[PDB]
């Protein structure tokens, strides 16, 4: 009761730090899972983006608690965690997520690869899974929680272009679908 409750997948089971999950849209008419893609003239590192096809699951991620690994290995709400894609990268580097310290295209993006503009804390890679007012069971929002607390949303240019996950409103409502080992 005191400790944060566990996060749950689409099958109602608790999220584990030793398993993989697709980060799907709660409303599939708004796109599919999350993946990696280059953007804004850049070739590397790859940006965390959202596949526009509601039928696609995107790439699976592995979630690890930020502090000391609990004996139960259960992912919990309001708890700092690290997120990384379990997928191949054409930039051949780290697939772990971190918030872009820069303001490319006048926007803060979630990106992968090496931290090029570090901070005194080394928390650029800290995130949290949270609930929200009026949220349906199994549905959640993601937040950057390193040197600030900010909801993650999706930048979509309906004119034709990659959709990128970054710091903006309104937040993206997601569900976690257990991925085959």
């Amino acid at each position: 009761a005191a400790d944060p409750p566990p996060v749950h997948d689409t099958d109602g089971h608790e999220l584990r730090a030793d398993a993989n999950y697709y980060v799907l849209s709660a409303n599939r008419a708004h796109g599919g899972g999350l993946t990696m893609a280059p953007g804004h003239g850049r070739h590397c590192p790859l940006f965390v983006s959202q596949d526009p096809n509601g039928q696609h699951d995107g790439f699976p991620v592995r979630i690890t608690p930020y502090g000391v690994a609990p004996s139960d290995k259960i992912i919990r709400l309001s708890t700092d965690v690290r997120i990384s894609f379990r997928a191949y990268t054409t930039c051949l580097q780290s697939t772990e997520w971190h918030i872009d310290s820069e303001l490319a295209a006048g926007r803060r993006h979630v990106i992968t690869g090496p931290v090029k503009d570090p901070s005194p804390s080394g928390r650029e890679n800290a995130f949290r899974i949270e609930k929200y007012s009026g949220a349906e069971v199994h549905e959640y929002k993601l937040m950057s929680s390193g040197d600030w607390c900010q909801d993650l949303g999706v930048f979509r240019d309906l004119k034709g272009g990659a959709w990128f996950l970054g710091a903006t409103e309104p937040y993206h409502v997601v569900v976690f679908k257990k991925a085959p080992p």
Partner: protein
Amino acid sequence: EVISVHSLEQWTMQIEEANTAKKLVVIDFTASWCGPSRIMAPVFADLAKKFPNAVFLKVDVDELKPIAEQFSVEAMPTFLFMKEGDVKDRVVGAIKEELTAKVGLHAA
């Protein structure tokens, strides 16, 4: 020296007042549930003394969201620098050194 604002009406009074005194206003938009925000409290409280000729206000975004949506504040903590009604600059995050610095440049 750090004045917490508890109502939209109180906010207007504090701003109008400081404006008549031609003082600089530094504002910290906070969240009690946000780790990064708590950490910055002491740093804000201390600079509150470091500069008495400026006004330090504390605004909890859960309590006075309209003030945040008014100045485009979506991350916490966020420090706003105002004077005569217009924003002069803002620091986003628990970036201590960038705070303790941008304060001297606008205050003194």
